[model samples]
Structures are given as C-alpha cells and as structure tokens.
Target: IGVCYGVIGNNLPSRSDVVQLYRSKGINGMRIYFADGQALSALRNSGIGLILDIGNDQLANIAASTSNAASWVQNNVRPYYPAVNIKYIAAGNEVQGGATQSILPAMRNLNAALSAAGLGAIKVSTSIRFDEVANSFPPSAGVFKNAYMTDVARLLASTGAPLLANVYPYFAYRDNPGSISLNYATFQPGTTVRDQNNGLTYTSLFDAMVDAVYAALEKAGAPAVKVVVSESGWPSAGGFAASAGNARTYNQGLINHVGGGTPKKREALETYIFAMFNENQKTGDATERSFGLFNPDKSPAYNIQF
Candidate 1:
C-alpha cells in the first residue's frame, strides 16, 4: 500500500521523520505533489517506491521546450537516480481546460529526457479522476468523455505505462447518499450492483469506479494500459457523513481489498491513499483539509493499519 505525502500543513512532521514513519509502518510507496528536494533527500535508501509529480503549472513550460524537460530531469531526477526509487513521473494531475492539451507533450518530453538519461525504467504518465469517463454506471458501458483522454490512453498503452486514477467513493456517496448506500461505499456487505453489460458484479463502489476506468481504456483502444489508483480516501471531518469511524472503515477496507483486484481485472492494484496527514494550511472546505489518515502530530486520526 502507498500514502500520498502532502506537505501543505504548517504543523506537520519533519520530512525525514515522515519518511521514517512510512518505513516504520511498513508502507512501501509514496506520491508527492512536486519535486521536493527535502523529501527526495530523506527518501534516499529508504527503498520506498515513489511517484514524483510534475506540477500542473509546469506542464505548458515543459511542453513548450524539450530542453526545459531535460533540465527538469537533470535537476530533479538525475541526482536522485535509483536511490530514491523514483517509479513514475506524473506529468500532471487532474489537468483541465487549456492546460489539458499539454499533458501528452509534457509526458513525451519527460519520457525522452528520462530515456536520454538512461532512466527509462521510470515510467512517465499522468493522474486523472474517474469523471474522465462519461458513462460509468455499469462499468462496461464506460467511455472517455473527452478526446484528450483517448489520446493520453493511446500514448500510455504504447509505452506500457499505467494510468494513475484518483478514485473516491466518498464524494459520490456524499452527493447522493440516498441513492448510494453507505455500506457499498465503505466496502461492507450490503448492496451488490451487477453490471448487466458484462455480467460482472460489484460489491464496492471503489471496484465499480476502477472498472469503469478499465472499460474506458478498452473503448479508447488502449486495453493494455493498467490503472494505478493514485489517490483514494475518505475524510474524517467536515460535511455530511464525514466521521472518523467512516473514514477508518473506508480506508481499512481499501487497504485490505485492493490486493485482490477488482471484479474486472483479477490482479493486485497499486493504489495510493490520498494523504498522510491532515493539512491545516490547505485552502479548501474542511473536508479538503481533513483527508489525511493521520493528524499533524503523527497520530492516527482514527485507528488505521497501514
């Protein structure tokens, strides 16, 4: 299992301590939002796999010049090498509007830079949300809502890179609690929604959401592209049903479930929990700041195992 090491908090743990925390907990993976030098430095020899993201604002700049991409690699990646265990360079995260068009080229340039540096093993891809697909109700009937996804999927398929998806059933359930049962959202034994389109059964909304992305890839002619859940978690506070108990239930269930794969694909999934600690400085609703699995003081927000 993996955890997103977000540093938007004013009272969070030291970078090295955070790295040590992951090691102590037996958490083997991490996903950071940017080229954080301190995080990378602490991660040295830690043996934890990492997903290093190229921030959204840097997309156009990197895509605008191949040399800029190369420079990015030279500074952020070349120095770290295999020591930091840099697994994938996420070109962007949930990019939208005018910046969406630059995702592919940025990934391409970054890939080229990595190749030239002989670090080609480090995959280059982008993270996206489940909404990228228009119709995900039955999973099998899923399709990309935009042309950008189709192109991105094609490139990912050609390069054998997995599409990073941030899947959250909490938002869906919170928005339509009456329609979505809490049990299904939390992976408890409650409702079962069968996808008649392909005879697959879904016990958890998480699986259904992931399968929808899989179906979308197939329809986009990129069936070979695997999906790595880049972010998934429920909040402990703020808004409806955002209780500590529910967050623990959903997160623990996710930790225990993903190893067995979803109904559509019978294999282990590389998934990353949304965050490590709640950020006090985050500029969103209370729910946004409350997505952390732990509080800023390195204590569990609730009882969670890995």
Candidate 2:
C-alpha cells in the first residue's frame, strides 16, 4: 500500500519530515503528482516505493520529441533512480479532451528513454479515473468509452505495466446516494451485490469499481494488464455523507481489505490512499482540500493504522 504525497499546501511539513513520518508509520510506498526535487531528495535511500507522475502540462512537449523525453528522464529520473526507488512513471493523471491524445506517445517515449538508460524495470503508465469505463453497472459489462484506452491498455499489458486507476466510490455514492448504500461504498460488511455476468459476489464498491476496470481491460484485449489503485479515499467534508467518522471508517476499512483483493481477481492488490496532508491551497470543491489523512502539523486527521 501507498499514500499520495500532495504538496499544494502552504503550511505542510517539510519533505524530509513527511518522509520520516511515512517511515515511522510503516507506510512503504508513495505517489507524488510531479517530479518534486525536494521530495525526491528526501526520499533518497528511504526504501519507499514511488510512482512519479509526469505532469499533464508537459505531455505535449514530451510526446513531440524523444529527446525531450530523454531530457525529462535525465533530469527527473536518472539523477535519483535506484536511490529513490521510482517504481512507475505515470505519463499523466485524469487528462481530458485534446490532452488525452498525448498520453500514449508520451508513455512510449518515456519508456524508451528509461530503457535506453537501463531503468526498464521501472514501468510507464497513465493514471485514469474509473469513469473511463462505460456500462460499468454489473462489473462485467464494462468497456472503455474510447478506443484510445484500448490502445493504451494493450501497450501497458504488452510491456508488463499495471493500468493506474483512481478508483473513488465516494463520488459515485455522493452523486447518487439514493441507490448506492453507505455500507457498500465504505467497505463495511453488510450489503452485497452479485454480478451475474461474472458470477462474482461483491461486498464493497471499491472491489466492484476495480473489477469493472478489469472487465474493461478484458474486453479491450488486454487481460494481462493489472489494475493499480493509484488513488482512493473518502473526503472528510464538503459534501453529503462526508464526515470525519465516515472517512475514518472507509479509509481504515480500505487499509485492512485491499490485501485480500476483489472477488473477480484474488491476489493482493496494489493500492494507494489519496493523500498525506490536506492541501489548503488546492482549488475545486472543499473536498479537494479535505482528502488528507493528516494535518499540516503532521497530526493524524483521524486515528488510522498505516
């Protein structure tokens, strides 16, 4: 399991302090939005696995030229590779419209750059939201909304990389509380939804969301590709059913349950919690700034055991 290290807050702890806290708390992995120099420096020799994102803004430039990709790898990756434990280079995150066109080429060039640098063990993939899958109801009828996703998934599967997915049941629940139960969304042990298509019984929305992606991959002819839960969490505030107690319950439940995998695929799933600190500077709804598991002072937002 991992925690995302978001640095959009003005009053957040130092990078070194954050690294130390992660170590102290027994967290073994981290996902950073961009190739942050200071955070990279702090993470050196830390032994924590990392998923480094290549910003969406740089996608076009990186895709335009292989040299640019190589330069990015040289500056951001080569400088601190084995020492920093970079496991994956996510080409972009939840990219939209015309920007989505750049993802595949960027991933290719970045992977090529890594291969030339002898860092091919580090995978290259893009982070996408679960909404990319359409007809996701029964978890077995899911398919990519666009053909680009099929191509991307094929590349990932061929290259032995996991498809990074930001699977959030919170949004699904919040948007339609009339249908999805709180117990199902939060991983609480009560309600069950059986997918007759795959004949797998689902207990939590997280598993259903994940399995839907798996079904999408299978339909896209990329069954070999694994789904990595790149980001998952419940917000403590800013929307209906968002509360500290619910956040604690959901997050804590996720922490305990992920290692067991979903009913569709029973292997230990690679998952990362949304964030480490509440980003006071973050834009969007208040929940965007409230996903943090910790406060700026490095205190736990609610009691959680790694």
Candidate 3:
C-alpha cells in the first residue's frame, strides 16, 4: 500500500516532499527496511500505516535471547508506534535463503516483546519470496520446497500474522517468454488459463501465483494463515520486454485485482508495490533498480494511479 522510499537518488528529496508524495498518490501504507529516524519524523501525524523490518544480518543476534529481541523492539519500534500507525514488524527479508531457523525465533521473541509492551496488535512475520514453493503448476499442486515452512506457517497462523509473499510474475514471463504470455502475467484479459484440477479460471498470473501459495499453505498444514502480497511490481528497464508501459500496466492491474482478491479466496486481498523510487545505488540486472512507481526525485514515474 506504500512505497519503500519516497526518494531514491544520491541526493534525496526533502523528507517533507517524500511524505507529501504518499499523500498525493493516496497510498496510506509503507514498509521500511530500517527505523530511520527522519522517516519516522516525516510520517509523524501523517496517518500512514508502516510495516517495519530488521535486516537479515541482525536476525542471529536478535534470536540469541528474549532480551535481545526486547531491546530491538525498544530501540527500533517502541518510540514510533501509535504515532505512526505501525502495523507489522518483519523479522527479516526472505529468511528461507540464509537465516532460516533464526527467522521464527526472532519473530517469537518480537511477539513476546510486543506483548510485554502492550503492542501485541502489531503483527510479527517475515517476507518470503515465491521461490520457496517447490512446485506450483495447476495451482492445486503447489507445495513448499522445505519442510521448515511448517513451523513458520504455524507461528504465523498462531500469532494471527500474515504469510507475507513477494511474488514477481515478471520473472515468470521474462524467463519463459515463449511459453508465458505477457498478457497473462500483466493482468490482461482474454488470455485465461484453466486449472483443470478445480476448473478455476486464471486470467492473470497474479491470481495463479497467489492461489499456488494458498495451496502450498494448505499442504503445509497452515491453511488459515492470512496471505499478504508483501511486494509486487514490474521493471521498466534493463531487459528487452521491460518498458514503462509494461510497468504501468502490471502495477495498475495488480492494484485493481488485489482489491477484489482471487476467485478462490473470495475476500479482498492486501497488496504492497515493490518500491517508491528507483534507488541510484541499486545494482543488479537493469530491472532490479527500475521497479519504482516514481522517479528518483518526488515525481510520478508515469501518469498512473495508486
């Protein structure tokens, strides 16, 4: 629902300008990698709900004991809770890759810390990439790659936290351009693919990806864990099919479809776009840095709605 950084260039825009950009776009939620004091300052009284994250490196330290996690909550989150509408605390980003065991322990510690501080309303979970899925064909055939998911899923459901997923349909289309149609991935209609297992029609890859996760969670015995699109967006540069038009189309479609949820889930889903601005120091395939909804300065990337 919010951009990660309102400004992304080397010389960033004023904090006030960044906050104003969110207001201008009517996006009211934000996910930050750090508890930047200045960002907390700008969002003061701004009514933007925040999902704050601690970096992956710190997980081992935070997981050492309850006291460490308590200290983290005290320093990073305690000072800026009711003032900034902080909704969730992500223990780490894509923990399955490097710090698998540490993820849940840190989350549990955070849970205890939040309870101690009377901030239990804030959910604790970690964002995971769709790569965690071992197989996802036919939607119903989805299953987690590692059995470790069961414990994490259990914690998420027990804590009433979401199984946050960072899904990228762009990778699907880009990697297999001949097989996966750009129209299907971009939420364009009339390119539906039927899942014969249940006969649920999938006109968009976004729904297919989500349903796959639902199927996986069900398989992992955590059927009730709420699914949240932690991150989703398309690139505008650094690849042949990457274009501003493609980025705009993908984001617009995501915005519209996520609101109504998918046919299987039936309830409206919550989604957050990948980024706010194209960060200057980002290094990867050209696409890595180009997923912003705005330019480095505080301007909209294109004439697109939130």
Candidate 4:
C-alpha cells in the first residue's frame, strides 16, 4: 500500500513541510484531496507521483461542458504537470453520493481535455467503495450493483482507467466483528479464512477486500481492467477499534501483505493509505476524523515502518 495525503482543513502545517514529510518517509506515490496550488507547487520537482482529486462538489459544473473541462485542466492541472508528477485526476470521490452518474461524462470530458491539453497519459478515474459490490464474500460471488456502477465500470474499462477502489478492511472488521478475524484485520497471521471458490488463502482483510474488488470487476465482464486501492487505513483514535497500536500494525502489515500483491491476482497492485495527517475539522463518526499516521505537528502518531 502507498500513502494518501489529505489536505482537508485550516490546520495543515505547511504545503512544503507536507511534501518533505512524504519524501523523507520514502513515499513517492500518493493521492491529494484537492488541486491546491501550494500543494502542487511544493510537490514540483519532488518526483512524487500524485492521484489528484476534483471532488464531488465540483462535478456538476466541470462535467457540464468540454470547454469547462478544458478550463479546469488549464487552471488546475496544466500549470503543475510534469514537475508535480500528476498521474491521475479522480473526477470525484465516492460517486455514489454527490456526483452519481454525471461522473461518467465528467471523466470523458476530463480525459478529452487532458488529450487536448497535451497530457493524455495521465489517467482519469473516480474513487469508489466496497459497498458498491453487492456480494463481496467468497471473492468469486462479487458483483457490482447494477444501474449505479455498471456504467461506472464500463466507461473506465473503455478508457483503460482502473476503478479507483476505496477498500477499507478496518470498517469491514468493525461491521462484521468476530465474523471478520481481528488477526486477519491487523495482518497478525493465523488468517484462516480461505475463498473456497478461488482456492486462495487470505492472510489479511485488506487482500480479501482487494480480491473481492477484482472479483467485482471480473463479474462485470471487465476482468482486464486494473483495480487500484485509492484509500485504505486503520484509524488511530476517536473510537475503541481505532487505536494507535492497531493503526501502526495495520498500516505496516498492509504494506507487507500487498507488497507481493494478492494470491488471487498474482500481480503487484498500487494501494493508498488514507490521510497524511488528521484533520480536526472533518465531520463524521469518531474514526472519520482520525485516520492519520502523523499528527498535524508533523510528528508521527506511531512508528509506521512503511
């Protein structure tokens, strides 16, 4: 798994410091929640690859027209491209809510705009969650919810952009409790759950979630399309299941577990751990605001080896 650098509120230390933090930590790949100039400027020449977001809030206007999409690139992307190492533009995060079906055209227009802007190799995708898959257990029975995600997957395959899957094993364990092994959740070993249909042993909930995503795509008839983990992390505070030790173990173990990819796919997969630093202003359940490895002070909350 890789890093997800979130810039959510007024408390971000400094754009430059954030860049340096990732650089020093040996994290060369990440996802930025916004296209802030300061963040892009700090990332310039750092050689850190980023999957930038265009948030669901802006999709209506951005997807309204190609001209608008072109202007978006000209304004947010083109200025800090090669220097910023902008790899992908996530049209929207969790299209199931804010952007919905409009994301399809938004992605198309964005990609067309990218080609027109002379930056076509940079992929265009959206972040989705495991909830979109109706049946994720047993891996093979996975199927994307019809009407909502069919077009989402179809368009992505057509453009060769993998579905930006936000797979969260933490939530899976929280939601399922004993049914989801804590040992498997933290990658501690003794992960006895095996997919009988696929004949693959799951040592961690993270891998099980990923293979489930691939199974979803395969069931959708787009088996060739890649599935990248756009967001995955164990929260460190704000709840009982969210603790510092669990966070460290889960994050580090995620790196080890995914380092060689899943037994189901047998191909290296790119994954992103959620949030760079905790943003205090975030609103949700307790854990929503507590998914950072580092405090806002730039001090690590725990010793994250990866």
Give the TM-score of each candidate. 0.99, 0.99, 0.96, 0.96
lDDT of 3 by residue, 1-306 (tens): 655663445866777778888888898888877667788778888999887887787899888888998898898778877888888878888875557978878888889988998888999988889988877888888999887688888888777898878889999888889989988989887687888888999888889999999999988888888887888889888786889999999988887777788867988887888888887667768787788888876677876777
Cα displacement (angstroms), candidate 3, residue 135, comes to: 1.3
* Model 1 lDDT, full chain set: 0.92
lDDT scores of the candidates, listed in order: 0.92, 0.92, 0.83, 0.83
Per-prediction tally of clashes = 0, 0, 0, 0
Tens digit per residue, CA lDDT, model 2, 159-188: 999999999999999998999999999988
Q: What's model 4's overall lDDT?
A: 0.83
CA displacement after TM-score superposition, residue 273 of candidate 3 (Å): 0.7
TM-score attained by model 1: 0.99
Model 2 CA lDDT for position 162 = 93
Segments of candidate 2 deviating more than 4 angstroms: none
What digit string (tens of lDDT, one per residue) describes model 1 on residues 175-247?
Answer: 8889999999999997999999889998999999999999999999998899999999999988788899999
